[PDB]
């Protein structure tokens, strides 16, 4: 039912920019808080960004503040993660995350996408 | 900076009971942290096992139980099956709208 | 007679302005009503049972078990805002008026036409329609309110909202007493929860029939029926919302230091220690005087168990709440308990050209701030030692009953003698206008489905039916169904709803919120290139008023 | 004119006794009011923010975040008991009277004096004060109650309680709408709880100004202002307390054996087995008839969640309670929720010669016994098998939510259709007299801050200001602050508050409780050797009355 | 009570009113605001929950 598909992951040189797009289906996209998590090659999961509320309030981890922008388009049921000034430390698999609690958020990743790999190398 | 600590590796025999723990270097874990447990297999995306410290998503076997033990979150697998061998990651809600993830525990079924 | 009309089509709203800022708003509504002869000429006692659905553990909220008397009559109901006002009239009302009164109601049926259908035996279907000049339409006005009150707006079954679109009446039915028990369960419960329908209590049986209770008029093509003017005795309805929470009642604290430069980071400071301040608090064991602890005259709104289902003789029902959720305005996704959700078809605001059985739905967020934000609630010890420790505070995240998805706020009730709340706002176009008051000894302070409540009574329900058109082979002794000539009726219904309203006044320097057409909603009020119309909902209590 | 007085000083209380035991109590109150020209001539929208204090986990009860409009006007408020009565008058009222009515209110400003201050350039400070005979005082009476109601007694900012001590008005401000969210926490919570101020809702903005809403009178030295008599329509206020708990309602059980010798150890005995007794109980599955289970007509008082904080659009606020704690009379240390705590300065009862910002504080214990003793409450199973076992009883010591400092009584609500309670007693001298009723559709049954509530309206707030005294260098185009001649005013305020009271009657053989001067409190009512005065609080509902 | 009875035991009866305004608490329940059906264990408080 609830499906999330990430795309846009590609090899990019350091200092570049890239926009990951997450398409959601099987649920009302605008009613759920979404987010981006990332796992470095051989490392554990790390929370990247979160978008919540009907006003599309956004929060970012310290490692990506000022460089990453999380947005959403409910008409297209899409979640956008725009990364600027990409570093080698940003190379990882980025997973779409959906919180299952619309009026009472679970405050945890209810659904995950397959993930998109991003490689930053000169 | 918030740091989530959990056992780097753990082992359990088939049909046995194992407990993975998730704590905070400074502070304690409570139901206000909404501990979440996710399972990841090699070459696959994470799977949500537990949310809100007790709720397992539909389709998750009942052998997975979430709770708060002491000052940490606990994920107990009873009657562990061969397919339960994977990396288990713990997520803590650090207030406001900030989330933190544990180092992960590699559970291998002997 | 046959070739003489018995009424005039009128669908105009008149605003007759009085002295002292009062206006009489007389809304006229005319419809063409199509009625088919009833499927059955008898009354049926039908038990609807969906034990299959609720036998799934955790589905007890989907219980539909009940018993209804299905009658051969149809109900003509105009108790909805869309039957009377178009978006322009509603805009004028909600923008220029501060309060609304329900003055009177009239309805009448005229230009009755009855046609019989003759279907040929030719293999490809073909049929003709002939005027049955001697056929009759049975019309019953229950002016004494003997029959059960069954408003159609709760089922989205009132008359259509478009003057130029013919509408239909709804087949009438009412609830028959039944006994039902359903033990709640959840996904993971073991065994079969107690789920039985026990039948009917003989001491509660009430079988009503229109024939034995109401006079019936037989209208031929040259006849018309008028109910006569009924006058309401309801309370005024406010078209203004209150914004003041308990945190905004009374005199604010004096700021001994004020910002020296404008900007969001520059704040005024009270300048006095919270435990050294002067004032009055209901906490007699603390010296702290803060915005959260200082005494207020009373409480605005209340907290009640939300999504609580109470079981009674006839099964489980959701516990209603007067006010909607707080924070549904800062976050539209927070709309849940107390925020009414309206589902309707193409007759009542949905795009008329849509296909399928899926209705158009919207959740109504009231501008009044009487709701609660349970995530920000907490309880703590009478000792009140700050900062509060773990064991001395019960937070909304603390499990209740061992369940991590249930907290004290779910079972929390703060209704008391100090509670102050507002009546529900009108919901346009799908909201109900008036509702009959309960016949209990102690009556509710308000209804959550209509802004006006009938203290003594409100106009009798109008019932219509096609009089039996028998063939030559009728035999009342036969156990088979009555054989009738296929007959139907088309009649014009005209109603007049009279309100009394007060023009609003500008009390503040700043302007207030008004309903306006803009690029985003521009095409919600005009037909498409093929004639597709819709009526989107509009908010009523736009302007603010001071609570204290 | 300049050398003509426009009023007389009157601070006398007259008791005019009527027929049938009624007395008109007309309290006159005269004060010398000193007013300084406003710090700023503009209206300011100031956001007070103390996120630093509430960022400490467990300090959410100390939230002071809010937004206020600070106005250049000052409020003249006499809505406190101490402004009208001295201890002797209050003693007479509370001892000889059983009920009190609020009849009328008048106020007036006279003998206006305006002085400008000239400060010399000499290095040691030196200044002179000159009469500005052409200067004006701006006086606005909001008789229409257009402005927000901001009673000063809740902030201890009414006029002084001493006729011979000059007083001041309070700078006026009112609440501006704001949105705020604060997730509760405790000592031990990990992370940063959600704590943001979201701004203002445009649909709730209400910017009031005195100039655009109220007529303004310019009073020169020879001018006076009178508001005119206002007449109240409030309910009577009882000066008697009820002592009967549900345990003392109705006919006591008949004692078949009575003590044969006086003494505390000799008790009368009912003489019938508790399960063999006759009577009526609401427990239909038990044969026990005892003082705790026997049926009573209704419930006296109610239980509510105490120290519960409800969050709404503007943040958290404490849930008010109508009645004080039970047992606060047997143990004064039990005074907490519902026992109002008053904090005041030297103008309003504190020893006038004290130094420091620490206010004088007292918790008021009402004589009425409508409170609850939650430590003696319990719940038990419907089966009611006695003696009750562990699992069939929920005691006040049983943790709720896993917290050993929170029990069911903390979240327990027993308000219902059978609840009977009393209005709050007057609190002398610091208590409020009358309070405006909420403009909601459904109104609270009482207010916890004043014994009298304004059903329709109560007298408009009086606002005073020093008219701008510009210099010769005024330039309205300049962005800098207006340059004014340093001006201030001293005017005499006289008010008349008329009550109607009923003389009490002796109903019992024994005498009742009366307020009396004694050695312990003898010097609380007379000045010290240097003129230090104080006004200690007095209880009002001294005499008892039978509830049933 | 039967006037010829002997002993201090009174005659007793519980009155059952015909009005159906009562409650059947065994059929009550609370559940989460999310209202995801069928409801799971942690999202529902049942009359059997301690």
Is it true that the peptide bond before D505 is cis, omega within 30 degrees of 0?
no
Min Cα–Cα distance to chain A from C529, Å: 24
Q: Are strands D97-119 and D225-226 parallel, antiparallel or unpaired?
A: antiparallel
Cα–Cα distance between D499 and D25 in angstroms, integer?
5
Q: Are C403 and E31 inside 8 Å of each other by CB? A: no
Q: Are B54 and E40 inside 8 Å of each other by CB? A: no
The DSSP element (H or E) to which D22 belongs, if any, is: strand D22-36
Cα–Cα distance between B24 and B3 in angstroms, integer?
6
Cα–Cα distance between D7 and D490 in angstroms, integer?
14
Q: Identify which of D49, D58, D32, D283 has the alpha carbon closest to the alpha carbon of residue D167.
A: D32
Min Cα–Cα distance to chain A from C328, Å: 9
* Residue D253: exposure state from Cβ atoms within 10 A (0-12, 13-18, ≥19): middle
Q: Residue B96 — left, alpha, or beta (φ > 0 → left; ψ -120 to 50 → alpha)?
A: left
Contact C432, C342 (CB under 8 A): no
Contact D59, C387 (CB under 8 A): yes
**A102 near E CB under 8 A:** yes
Cα–Cα distance between C308 and E44 in angstroms, integer?
10
Cα–Cα distance between B8 and B14 in angstroms, integer?
20
The DSSP element (H or E) to which C240 belongs, if any, is: strand C240-242
Tokens of D41: 């001539």
**Three-class HEC string of C113-143:** EEEEEEECCCCCCCEEEEECCCCCEEEEECC
Cα–Cα distance between E21 and D390 in angstroms, integer?
32
Cα–Cα distance between C372 and D313 in angstroms, integer?
7
| Dihedral (CA of D367, D368, D371, D376) sign | positive
Q: For E46, list phi and psi in degrees, rounded to 5.
A: -100, 160
Min Cα–Cα distance to chain E from B53, Å: 10
Cα–Cα distance between C277 and D358 in angstroms, integer?
8
Closest chain C residue to B59 measured between Cα atoms?
C187
Q: For C500, list phi and psi in degrees, rounded to 5.
A: -120, 125
N- to C-terminal Cα distance for chain D? 63
In angstroms, the Cα distances linking C47 to B24, C65, C173, C310 are 58, 7, 12, 22
N- to C-terminal Cα distance for chain C? 63
Q: Which chains touch D (3 or more CB pairs under 8 A)?
A: B, C, E
Closest chain B residue to C399 measured between Cα atoms?
B31
Contact C279, D156 (CB under 8 A): yes
- C-alpha gyration radius of chain D: 28
Contact D517, D86 (CB under 8 A): no
SS3 A50: strand
Cα–Cα distance between D441 and D457 in angstroms, integer?
15
SS3 D299: strand
Q: Identify which of C115, C137, C117 has the alpha carbon closest to the alpha carbon of residue C128.
A: C117
Could you say which DSSP state residue C479 is in?
Answer: S
How crowded is residue D325: how many other Cβ atoms within 10 Å of its Cβ? 23
Q: Identify which of C48, C300, C70, C383 has the alpha carbon closest to the alpha carbon of residue C197.
A: C48
Cα–Cα distance between C212 and C71 in angstroms, integer?
13
SS3 C89: helix
Q: For E14, list phi and psi in degrees, rounded to 5.
A: -100, 130
b/e code B60-95 from CB counts within 10 Å (16+ = b): beeebbbbbeeebbbbbbeebeeebbbbbbbbbbbb
In angstroms, the Cα distances linking C8 to A116, D85, D395 are 69, 72, 72
* Residue D373: exposure state from Cβ atoms within 10 A (0-12, 13-18, ≥19): middle
Cα–Cα distance between C258 and C249 in angstroms, integer?
21
Resolution (A): 2.7
Interface test with B, best of D183, D191, D196, D402 (most B CBs within 10 A): D191
Cα–Cα distance between D271 and C338 in angstroms, integer?
55
Interface of B with C (CB under 8 A): 30-32, 34, 52-55, 58, 62
Contact D527, D533 (CB under 8 A): yes
Tokens of C396: 């909304």
Is it true that the peptide bond before D429 is cis, omega within 30 degrees of 0?
yes
Q: Any bridge partners for residue E1, and if so which? A: none
Cα–Cα distance between D82 and B86 in angstroms, integer?
75
Cα–Cα distance between C173 and E49 in angstroms, integer?
39
SS3 C66: strand
Contacts of C61 (CB under 8 A, 6+ apart): C309, C316, C318, E31, E35, E37, E39
Contact A87, B28 (CB under 8 A): no
Cα–Cα distance between C210 and C141 in angstroms, integer?
9
Q: For C409, list phi and psi in degrees, rounded to 5.
A: -60, -30
C–E interface: beta-carbon pairs under 8 A? 112
DSSP D446-511: --SS-SEEESS--PPPEEEEEPP-B-TT--TT-SSPPPB--EEEEEEEEEEEEEEEEE----SSS-
Could you say which DSSP state residue C425 is in?
Answer: P
Q: Are B33 and D191 inside 8 Å of each other by CB? A: yes
Min Cα–Cα distance to chain E from A87, Å: 40
Residue for token digits 């006002």? C85
Residue for token digits 């700021």? C255
SS3 D36: strand
Max Cα separation, chain E? 64
How crowded is residue C12: how many other Cβ atoms within 10 Å of its Cβ? 12
In angstroms, the Cα distances linking C349 to B60, C352, C362, D367 are 42, 8, 11, 60
CB nearest to E12's CB, from D272, D273, D287: D287
Cα–Cα distance between B41 and B57 in angstroms, integer?
17
Cα–Cα distance between A82 and A89 in angstroms, integer?
16
Q: Identify which of C284, C295, C280, C283 has the alpha carbon closest to the alpha carbon of residue C247.
A: C295
Contact D515, D87 (CB under 8 A): no
Cα–Cα distance between C16 and C29 in angstroms, integer?
17
How crowded is residue D66: how many other Cβ atoms within 10 Å of its Cβ? 25
Contact C353, C532 (CB under 8 A): yes
Q: Are strands A3-7 and A18-25 parallel, antiparallel or unpaired?
A: antiparallel
SS3 D87: helix
Contact A50, A110 (CB under 8 A): no
Residue for token digits 């003017």? C229
DSSP B18-34: EEEEEEESSS---GGG-
b/e code D417-450 from CB counts within 10 Å (16+ = b): eebebbbbbbbbbbbbbbbbbbbbbebbebbbbb
Helix then strand then coil, % of chain B, to nearest 5: 5, 50, 45
Q: Any bridge partners for residue D69, and if so which? A: D45, D174
Contact D137, D467 (CB under 8 A): yes
In angstroms, the Cα distances linking C541 to C85, C95, C428, D116, D262 are 16, 9, 11, 50, 71
Q: Are B99 and A47 inside 8 Å of each other by CB? A: yes
Q: Identify which of A105, B77, B67 has the alpha carbon closest to the alpha carbon of residue C402.
A: B67
Beta-sheet strands, E only, within D77-186: 97-119, 127-131, 137-141, 170-176, 179-182
Closest chain E residue to B67 measured between Cα atoms?
E42
Q: Are B32 and D194 inside 8 Å of each other by CB? A: no
Residues of chain E positioned with their CB less than 8 A from the CB of B54: 41-42
Cα–Cα distance between C414 and D415 in angstroms, integer?
9
Q: For D466, list phi and psi in degrees, rounded to 5.
A: -90, 120
Q: Are B96 and D185 inside 8 Å of each other by CB? A: no
- C-alpha gyration radius of chain C: 28
């Amino acid at each position: 039912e609830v499906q999330l598909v990430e795309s846009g992951g590609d090899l990019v040189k350091p200092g570049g920019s890239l926009r990951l797009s997450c398409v959601a289906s099987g649920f009302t996209f605008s009613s759920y808080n979404m987010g981006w998590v990332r796992q470095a090659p051989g490392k554990g999961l790390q929370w990247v960004a979160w978008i919540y509320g009907s006003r599309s309030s956004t929060n970012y981890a310290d490692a990506v503040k000022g460089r990453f922008t999380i947005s959403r388009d409910n008409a297209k049921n899409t979640l956008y993660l725009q990364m600027n000034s990409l570093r080698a430390e940003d190379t990882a698999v980025y997973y779409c995350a959906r919180d299952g609690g619309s009026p009472a958020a679970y405050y945890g990743m209810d659904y995950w996408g397959p993930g998109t790999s991003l490689f930053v190398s000169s | 900076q918030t740091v989530v600590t959990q056992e780097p590796s753990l082992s359990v025999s088939p049909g046995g009971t194992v407990t993975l723990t998730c704590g905070l270097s400074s502070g304690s874990v409570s139901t206000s942290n909404y501990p979440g447990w996710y399972q990841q297999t090699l070459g696959r995306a994470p799977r949500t096992i537990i949310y809100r410290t007790s709720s397992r998503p539909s389709g998750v076997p009942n052998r997975f139980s979430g709770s708060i033990s002491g000052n940490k979150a606990a994920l107990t697998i009873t009657g562990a099956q061969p397919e339960d061998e994977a990396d288990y990651y713990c997520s803590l809600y650090m207030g406001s709208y900030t989330y933190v993830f544990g180092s992960g525990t590699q559970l291998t079924v002997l | 007679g046959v070739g003489i009309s018995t009424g005039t089509f009128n669908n105009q709203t008149e605003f007759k302005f009085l002295e002292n800022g009062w206006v009489y708003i007389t809304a006229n509504s005319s419809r063409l009503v199509h009625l088919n002869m009833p499927e059955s000429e008898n009354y049926r006692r039908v038990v609807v049972n969906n034990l299959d659905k609720t036998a799934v553990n955790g589905n007890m909220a989907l219980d539909d078990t009940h018993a209804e008397i299905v009658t051969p009559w149809s109900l003509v109901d105009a108790n909805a805002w869309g039957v009377w006002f178009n978006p322009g009239d509603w805009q004028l009302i909600v923008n220029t008026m501060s309060e609304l009164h329900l003055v009177s109601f009239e309805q009448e049926i005229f230009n009755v036409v009855l046609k019989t259908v003759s279907e040929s035996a030719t293999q490809p279907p073909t049929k003709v329609y002939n005027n049955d000049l001697t056929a009759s339409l049975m019309v019953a006005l229950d002016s004494n309110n003997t029959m059960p009150f069954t408003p159609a707006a709760m089922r989205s079954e009132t008359l259509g909202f478009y003057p130029w679109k013919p509408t239909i009446p709804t087949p009438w039915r009412y609830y028959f007493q039944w006994d039902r028990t359903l033990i709640p369960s959840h996904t993971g419960t073991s065994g079969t929860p107690t789920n039985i329908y026990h039948g009917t209590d003989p001491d509660d049986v009430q079988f009503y029939t229109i024939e034995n209770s109401v006079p019936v008029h037989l209208l031929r093509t040259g006849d018309e029926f008028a109910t006569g003017t009924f006058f309401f005795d309801c309370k005024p309805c406010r078209l203004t919302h209150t914004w003041q929470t308990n945190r905004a009642l009374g005199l604010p604290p004096f700021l001994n230091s004020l910002p020296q430069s404008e900007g969001g980071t520059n704040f005024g400071y009270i300048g006095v220690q919270q435990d050294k301040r002067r004032g009055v608090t209901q906490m007699g064991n603390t010296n702290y005087i803060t915005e959260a602890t200082i005494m207020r005259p009373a409480e605005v709104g209340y907290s009640a168990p939300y999504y609580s289902f109470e079981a009674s003789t006839q099964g489980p029902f959701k516990t209603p709440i007067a006010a909607g959720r707080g924070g549904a305005q800062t976050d539209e996704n927070q709309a849940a308990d107390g925020d009414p959700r309206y589902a309707f078809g193409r007759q009542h605001g949905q795009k008329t050209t849509t296909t399928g059985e899926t209705p158009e739905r919207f959740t109504y967020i009231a501008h009044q701030d009487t709701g609660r934000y349970p995530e920000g609630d907490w309880i703590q010890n009478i000792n009140f030692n700050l900062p509060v420790t773990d064991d001395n505070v019960l937070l909304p995240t603390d499990p209740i009953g061992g369940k991590t998805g249930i907290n004290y706020t779910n079972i929390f009730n703060t209704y008391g003698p100090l509670t102050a709340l507002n009546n529900v706002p009108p919901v346009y176009p799908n909201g109900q206008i008036w509702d009959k008051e309960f016949d209990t000894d102690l009556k509710p302070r308000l209804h959550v489905n209509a802004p006006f409540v009938c203290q003594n009574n409100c106009p009798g329900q109008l019932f219509v039916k096609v009089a039996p058109n028998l063939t030559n082979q009728y035999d009342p002794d036969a156990s088979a169904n009555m054989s009738r000539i296929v007959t139907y009726s088309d009649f014009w219904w005209k109603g007049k709803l009279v309100f009394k309203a007060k023009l609003r006044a500008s009390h503040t320097w700043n302007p207030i919120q008004q309903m306006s057409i803009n690029v985003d909603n521009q095409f919600n009020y005009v037909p498409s290139n093929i004639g597709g119309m819709k009526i989107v909902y509009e908010k009523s209590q736009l302007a603010p008023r001071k609570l204290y």
